[PDB]
């Protein structure tokens, strides 16, 4: 009945060793965990709760050891009440960084379960198959990065400089074959662009692809694959001004369209200068967002109860083009108490705004513990609220998600969300 309300990372759960999605089965976020292709669907994106819990966006479940002893691991309900039972709970043990192909820096930890000190783990030595617990033995296949896509670089629609045309995806599912089109309000035209590499459809959550595999081909919509053919540059050698060559970090072959007049088939070509080869970034302005908490409600005595409810103020209907635009400009960053935040937070409240968009869910969440872990016995609960404004209209949004800090203290807290109070007045921060 009770979502988490102090989230500190939310997305793919990786393998340290294979590099595979820890995965779900089926997409209704239930069943038996194992490792999988990472396939885009929303039980792959996991939440590391700041509660000890790790659950994911698909249902509201707990990863959950099926026993004692070296057991299965699965995803089942959460035991919230009287209290959240440690062989639900998890902290990140010792740390392993590395740079992914993509060429962003991870971190891999061990995730160890509360109740019986034993780690996450894999079948094996290979990182792959069957997830359950077992005792921790170093092994890199005991450990988990959350997959950072490093900073969303560019985001929007991409019109061809030759014709004004832009980037299409046949149909509406933003699945299949890439072309050039008429320039349309829909979401399978708009495209996330990450320091890994990656250009994401923002409709069916995939990758700007090449067939095969040598990045000389026709492109279209794939699984995201991690592969450099899905990999693309936008060297300022090839920019003029605001219009930009990609090119292929597998074959260097130039995001192309069929002949001279930027009106047919997209693929891979060799470079040549020409304006068909050059895409601008369509999208509108809104302000670099500010995240603030707002005092929910306090207790000198005890224990605070409130209603939690995820609100979205707006001049107009939060369209599901409106929505896309400020996830888009989430993701690429906040400012809190005047300080830029971290990749993660960006990446993860730009998730947590677009899963807000059909509802919650108004719930009655308690106060157990302040979110530096110690037992709630007075204090404060506080809500998230973070602002920006559409700068053509100069009309502010306001988004209050069901997001939420308990602290000792009437001060507001020091801490960005997800983010960690470090202490019970919440003045400094971990997990950053
Ligand atoms: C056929 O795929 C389905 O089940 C597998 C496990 O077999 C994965 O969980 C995947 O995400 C889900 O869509
Ligand atoms: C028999 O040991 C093997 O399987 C267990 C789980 O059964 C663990 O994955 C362990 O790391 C692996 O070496
Ligand atoms: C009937 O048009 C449909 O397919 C074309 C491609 O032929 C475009 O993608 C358009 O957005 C879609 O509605
Ligand atoms: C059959 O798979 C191959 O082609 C598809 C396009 O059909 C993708 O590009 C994929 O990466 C590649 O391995
Ligand atoms: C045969 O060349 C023509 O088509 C290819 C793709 O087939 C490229 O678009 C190239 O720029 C164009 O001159
Ligand atoms: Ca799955
Ligand atoms: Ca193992
Ligand atoms: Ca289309
Ligand atoms: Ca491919
Ligand atoms: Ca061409
Ligand atoms: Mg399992
Ligand atoms: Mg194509």
């Known amino acids: 009945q009770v979502l988490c309300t102090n989230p500190l990372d939310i997305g793919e759960l990786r393998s340290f060793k294979s590099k595979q999605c820890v995965d779900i089965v089926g997409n209704q976020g239930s069943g038996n965990i194992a490792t999988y292709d990472c396939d885009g669907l929303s ?5 590391i709760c700041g509660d000890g819990t790790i659950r994911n966006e698909a ?6 050891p099926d026993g004692s002893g070296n057991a299965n691991v699965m995803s089942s309900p959460c035991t919230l009440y009287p209290e959240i039972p440690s062989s639900q709970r998890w902290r990140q043990g010792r740390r392993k960084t590395f740079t992914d192909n993509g ?3 991870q971190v891999a930890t061990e995730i160890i379960n509360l109740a019986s000190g034993k780690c996450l783990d894999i079948e094996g030595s290979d990182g792959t198959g069957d997830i359950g617990v077992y005792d921790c033995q170093n092994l890199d296949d005991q450990y988990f990065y959350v997959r950072s896509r490093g900073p969303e670089l560019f985001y929007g629609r991409l019109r061809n400089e030759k014709s004004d045309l832009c980037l299409d995806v046949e149909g509406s599912d933003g699945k299949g074959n890439v072309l050039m089109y008429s320039c349309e309000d829909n979401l399978d035209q708009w495209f996330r662009y990450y320091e890994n590499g990656e250009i994401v459809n923002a409709k069916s959550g995939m990758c700007l692809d090449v067939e095969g595999s040598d990045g000389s081909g026709n492109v279209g919509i794939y699984r995201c694959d991690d592969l450099r053919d899905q990999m693309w ?7 003029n001004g605001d219009y930009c060559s990609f090119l292929n970090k597998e074959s260097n072959k130039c995001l192309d369209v069929s002949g001279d007049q930027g009106t047919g088939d997209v693929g891979t070509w060799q470079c040549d200068g020409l304006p068909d080869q050059r895409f601008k970034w369509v999208f509108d302005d809104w302000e670099v967002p500010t995240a603030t908490w707002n005092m929910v409600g306090c207790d000198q005595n005890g224990k605070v109860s409130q209603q939690i409810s995820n609100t979205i103020s707006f001049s107009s209907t939060v369209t599901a083009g409106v929505a896309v635009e400020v996830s888009s400009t989430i993701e690429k960053g906040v400012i809190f108490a005047k300080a830029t935040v971290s990749v993660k937070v960006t990446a993860s409240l730009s998730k947590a705004w677009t899963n807000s968009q059909s509802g919650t869910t108004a719930i009655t969440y308690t106060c157990d513990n302040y979110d530096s872990d110690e037992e709630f016995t007075r204090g404060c609960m506080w809500q998230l609220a973070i602002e920006t404004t559409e700068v053509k209209s100069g009309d502010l949004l306001v988004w209050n998600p069901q997001i939420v800090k308990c602290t000792r203290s009437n001060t507001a807290p020091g801490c960005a969300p997800f983010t960690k109070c470090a202490n019970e007045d919440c003045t400094f921060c971990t997990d950053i």
């Open 59 to 64: 249902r509201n479940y707990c990863f959950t």
């Open 103 to 105: 060429g962003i820096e």
């Open 233 to 239: 540059s936008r060297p300022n050698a090839y920019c």
């Open 43 to 47: 039980d792959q994106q996991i939440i």
